Design a protein around this ligand. Structure first.
Ligand SMILES: [Mg+2]
Lengths: 49, 150
């Protein structure tokens, strides 16, 4: 939103897709959770000054 | 008197210039407008507070004489409060991401629209000295000095 000349950019478009993909692979219906992770993840989002 | 009537004689002529019947009379909506145009810069609060009443929706009804607006101008002048250039400059540095007073105009626009006395986008469009290129900067200090005049 603050990229007043580069808002709605494509990287911020891809970030929202990275989770559904790794959830389609990876996640599963266990007894306790219908979208069980089955893997741990650690996302790093990198920022400029 | 708190101001020279030899120049309030000019002020009576100045009061005549804007769109009205004249006749020695201005409307309360015009009192604040004239105080902006001729007096020291009032807040809306000062217009409502000094020699008037905050319950003033439809402010074109109430009417005051030039010789009543001049008491209003004098009573404001002796009770107003004023910040120095450094106060407003620091008020900009409070937003400064760059430490150099060059943040993009969209920040100044957002602040002037969003907070306080709620300025319109077209009023800032009259104020702005920059341009909508790929850099977008507005210099703080000299543009503050250009605005803070009279
Ligand atoms: Mg989980």
């Amino acid at each position: 939103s603050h990229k007043s000349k580069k808002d709605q950019g494509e990287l911020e478009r891809q970030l929202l897709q990275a989770n559904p993909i790794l959830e389609a692979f990876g996640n599963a219906k266990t007894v306790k959770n219908d979208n069980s992770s089955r893997f741990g993840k650690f996302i790093r989002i990198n920022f400029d000054v | 008197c708190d101001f020279s009537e030899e120049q309030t004689a000019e002020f009576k002529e100045a009061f005549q210039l804007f769109d009205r019947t004249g006749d020695g009379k201005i409307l309360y909506s015009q009192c604040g407008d004239v105080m902006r145009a001729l007096g020291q810069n009032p807040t809306n609060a000062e217009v409502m507070k000094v020699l008037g009443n905050p319950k003033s929706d439809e402010m074109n009804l109430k009417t005051l004489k030039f010789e009543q607006f001049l008491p209003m101008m004098q009573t404001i002048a002796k009770n107003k409060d004023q910040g120095c250039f450094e106060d407003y400059v620091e008020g900009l540095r409070v937003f400064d991401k760059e430490g150099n007073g060059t943040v993009m105009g969209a920040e100044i626009r957002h602040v002037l629209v969003t907070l306080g006395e709620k300025m319109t986008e077209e009023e800032v469009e009259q104020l702005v000295a920059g341009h909508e290129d790929s850099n977008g900067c507005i210099n703080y200090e000299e543009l503050v000095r250009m605005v803070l005049s009279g």
